[PDB]
Chain length 259, copies 4
Amino acid sequence: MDLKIKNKVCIITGGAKGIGYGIAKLWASEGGIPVIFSRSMPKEHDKELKKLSSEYEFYEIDLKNYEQIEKLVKKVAIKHGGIYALVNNAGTNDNLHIENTSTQDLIKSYENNLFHYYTMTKECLPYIKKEQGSILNIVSKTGITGQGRTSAYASAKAAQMGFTREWACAFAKDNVRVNAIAPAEVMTPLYEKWLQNFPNPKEQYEKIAKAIPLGHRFTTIEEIANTAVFTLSPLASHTTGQILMPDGGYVHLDRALNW
Amino acid sequence: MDLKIKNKVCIITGGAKGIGYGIAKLWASEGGIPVIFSRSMPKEHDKELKKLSSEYEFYEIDLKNYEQIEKLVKKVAIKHGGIYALVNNAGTNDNLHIENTSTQDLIKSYENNLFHYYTMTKECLPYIKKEQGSILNIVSKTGITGQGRTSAYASAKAAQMGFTREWACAFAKDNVRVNAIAPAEVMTPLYEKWLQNFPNPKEQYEKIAKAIPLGHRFTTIEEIANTAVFTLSPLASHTTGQILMPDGGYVHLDRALN
Amino acid sequence: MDLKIKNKVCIITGGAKGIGYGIAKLWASEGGIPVIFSRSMPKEHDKELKKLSSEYEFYEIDLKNYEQIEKLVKKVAIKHGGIYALVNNAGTNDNLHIENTSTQDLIKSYENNLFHYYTMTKECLPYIKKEQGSILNIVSKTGITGQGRTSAYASAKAAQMGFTREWACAFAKDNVRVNAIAPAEVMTPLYEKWLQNFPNPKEQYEKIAKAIPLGHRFTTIEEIANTAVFTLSPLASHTTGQILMPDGGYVHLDRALNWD
Amino acid sequence: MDLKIKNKVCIITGGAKGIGYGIAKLWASEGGIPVIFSRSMPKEHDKELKKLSSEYEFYEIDLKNYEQIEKLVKKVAIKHGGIYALVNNAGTNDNLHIENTSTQDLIKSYENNLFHYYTMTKECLPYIKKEQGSILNIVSKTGITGQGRTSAYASAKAAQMGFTREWACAFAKDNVRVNAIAPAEVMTPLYEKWLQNFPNPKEQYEKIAKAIPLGHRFTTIEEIANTAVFTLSPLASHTTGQILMPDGGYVHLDRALNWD
Ligand SMILES: NC(=O)c1ccc[n+]([C@@H]2O[C@H](COP(=O)([O-])OP(=O)(O)OC[C@H]3O[C@@H](n4cnc5c(N)ncnc54)[C@H](OP(=O)(O)O)[C@@H]3O)[C@@H](O)[C@H]2O)c1
Ligand SMILES: NC(=O)c1ccc[n+]([C@@H]2O[C@H](COP(=O)([O-])OP(=O)(O)OC[C@H]3O[C@@H](n4cnc5c(N)ncnc54)[C@H](OP(=O)(O)O)[C@@H]3O)[C@@H](O)[C@H]2O)c1
Ligand SMILES: NC(=O)c1ccc[n+]([C@@H]2O[C@H](COP(=O)([O-])OP(=O)(O)OC[C@H]3O[C@@H](n4cnc5c(N)ncnc54)[C@H](OP(=O)(O)O)[C@@H]3O)[C@@H](O)[C@H]2O)c1
Ligand SMILES: NC(=O)c1ccc[n+]([C@@H]2O[C@H](COP(=O)([O-])OP(=O)(O)OC[C@H]3O[C@@H](n4cnc5c(N)ncnc54)[C@H](OP(=O)(O)O)[C@@H]3O)[C@@H](O)[C@H]2O)c1
Ligand SMILES: [Mg+2]
Ligand SMILES: [Mg+2]
Ligand SMILES: [Mg+2]
Ligand SMILES: [Mg+2]
């Protein structure tokens, strides 16, 4: 399947690790040019990405400092000539529960998780409308299902769903598609490092994984990436406003399902 | 139908006008005790709520100053002895489009529209858990459907839908119900006045209303209030995590309906 | 709260037991007139309903014989002068799994569970349109979430959700509201008797109920009926096309939700 | 992007024309072997699929005669050695409105549109379980949003959404994925001929198409096929229970959206 993204430029926030890095590698393997906005870039990931795409660039930035975004996006546009797509992906489930988290710390969380989805989109939109491209927001099942001990993250992810539908409305006229991916549980090195923090790592993974209908296993990075990159590409050219769930049946299948 | 809310205390933010005021009246006429947090209270609304409920109170506050909330919720709880329910309703569709609104102005909208939903709920939760009460977030169609030129309002309303599900999860163990109402188009005095600014106020109303399948007309305040007050009451004792749409079919029915 | 349904006629299929009966009692208790279409009517239920409404009627019918519905609906209309509302409620989870149920037996399931939602609505529509009334479909969580061993019941319940949206579209211009209620687990006498057949009825109840976030307990019949009758009443006069879930958080809340 | 479907066998019902034929061509173009169950096969299509896959086969069947399905599916499994995927696609919007369609004609519509989704899945399941493959139901926007003059089609497509969730629950343990595609308006040669019968076919097209936010234009067959074949493929190996909308924003975007 020819995704027709060769030499198309995609900025991926938090594209240095985990899900965002999976999306970047697949974008690169398919001939697109990925540009990573993230706090740091592991040297080995930088090497793999350069090997995949000679035009790849890393821009070091903490996106809580959203005033830096206009200057950085402008550089990207000058260096490469335009921007086709944006993946808003940088975020952290910081498990801030309402009963013990101040409103001030909620706002701090929105700085780390939410505001730059707006700012990145705002500054990329001039260029993405030119190329009739794509915006993709990585949200989370928690914005839909809740979880119970993570008010700051749940509302930020739901807000990003609202942004998805709002921007799909705003730029349908422009042939710019806006979609979101809501993963449930995706195995990343950070996740594995968080499980290994447990007295019984296997038991703890099993507690989570047994609630996932398709295989009692976490979604892989590659599985999120495949759906993300397909959705970004011209091959999804009538898909917009979609909250997509490659999630093993987590959100939609009977909660009592077991085997 | 006996709603079983005689003397139950409900705080209603933005409850001085429009939708929230309709909820306060109904809450009161069914025997509940409404407590209004809002920027100001029209004299005539203050007189009407006092006739409906001798224990009703108005607390003047701009909820962008969310640090005032802890003190005010503690006062309510000391005066009446507790709090059964909270309606987070204060908000403004401020039509802030992403392409011409700064990120600083996005955050100012969230001060006006979003953060106090969290803070109000935070400070009421100890009392509402005590009474195994109800929290109701008034959200908006736009958080689900989008609109096109109101990025700050759509994300905030969608965020409030996430709060609704998150809190329903957090407090199911406590027998606290958390739901939302997503109105589409609701006729208020202030909506009527915005329409009246138009050279042709009727044409502008009809332009909007024709999109509404059930009757080509706006939802009334009473219609939002009936569903809100029923949903808050003990008669909806197994309803939680719901986003309710008393919206004339706006969100769900074929867009091409005519 | 005044629901404004005094002397309004509502036909409730399967109104003789379970959820439908709880809906019939509340309708009558709030001043409405319930008309029950069901296979049989327990004597003690006929007595309670008669005490709640002097004009309540029972019509004995098995709704797989959908050709009988036109004549039955016509007699109701002549007797009472009209019909304000219809509750399509009669149905059975027959646990017909695709891998060992024939297509023929799927169709028989639809005769029992599905076709009469259409025929009842068809024959009631002329009267409900005259009174700008209300149609309510009792569906199921399984139509949305699936279950795994009940193909016939899940597709029938999902079909009824499509009927709900389609008829809400069709009759919005007539000011006829059409909605649905999707219960999850509702404690009925038949549910309790089903549980009492297990080696350990309490432990089987708790196995099912543990998955219900709000109170680890079944929804009650009253809880369903309250949301039903409110939604039918003129007080929900801008509510249509809705699939309502008074279900304890079953459909929408995080599947991993866990509290002791 | 390597879909990893080389030599995988997919049966596509109604795959002779329109959406199903676009899915068949792309399946073959990506190395899969398509098998079409349909009423008839245009010569020009049989030639194009034969050119694309030397193992492609057509089986003439009117899927209302669902008893024929077992023998046909068994023939496919012997000939090709197995079946990896099934696309349930055959169907017709017959615009049967409740107020002038009998229950008997509703049931006839289900024979044309619904029952064979069940029978095809039932008979294909042993083979698809063996290959841990995929089932894809083509449904319709109308099963979600209603339309207003087509009760039989809206309920059938909603029932297929129920089947999608129910089968996804039933076979997750077997690593069998079950999803659905809900198109809104898709331009097919048959849709174009239908538009051409109008006094002003361009005006009628634009009346329908102006409600589609993304581009004021119908979805293409290619657009449906691409999402279909990706979702069927092993590259969507954690996607199940999904109702997917490649529909230009038809279902989810603000009904009042208006530009130019
Ligand atoms: N993994 C899951 O199970 C799961 C489930 C649902 C949703 N998600 C979503 O997936 C997205 C990516 O998460 P992940 O699981 O891939 O986590 P991850 O492995 O920690 O990767 C996140 C990346 O984003 C970067 N980042 C985060 N916040 C940033 C900020 N304010 N400025 C700059 N860089 C930032 C991180 O940088 P450093 O680590 O170097 O600071 C890291 O490179 C998130 O939006 C999350 O909501 C993940
Ligand atoms: N009306 C509709 O068609 C519609 C549609 C969808 C959603 N909604 C939702 O309904 C809710 C109420 O809207 P409405 O139409 O009833 O508006 P409204 O008639 O203008 O009333 C809003 C009330 O909230 C108050 N308020 C707003 N922000 C506040 C703040 N930061 N602090 C204190 N008070 C504040 C206003 O006070 P002042 O005016 O005195 O400042 C006013 O009393 C909103 O959350 C909105 O999202 C309404
Ligand atoms: N209870 C739950 O947990 C639950 C959960 C989700 C959805 N629901 C839905 O709620 C509705 C009512 O179920 P329920 O739990 O109240 O069941 P129930 O206690 O068995 O009551 C059903 C009533 O409907 C009657 N009935 C069923 N099929 C009929 C037919 N073809 N013709 C005439 N009468 C018929 C039954 O009569 P006989 O018993 O005399 O045959 C019985 O009186 C059903 O549509 C079901 O799908 C229930
Ligand atoms: N096109 C749209 O705008 C649209 C929108 C939403 C959903 N859909 C869905 O997409 C699917 C395909 O429709 P389409 O638009 O591609 O229609 P189409 O162009 O008419 O193609 C339908 C194909 O299926 C065949 N077929 C239908 N019923 C059959 C039966 N009982 N037995 C055997 N073959 C049968 C037809 O055969 P003959 O024509 O030779 O009889 C034809 O080859 C349908 O399930 C429909 O619900 C389409
Ligand atoms: Mg920085
Ligand atoms: Mg103040
Ligand atoms: Mg009979
Ligand atoms: Mg045949």
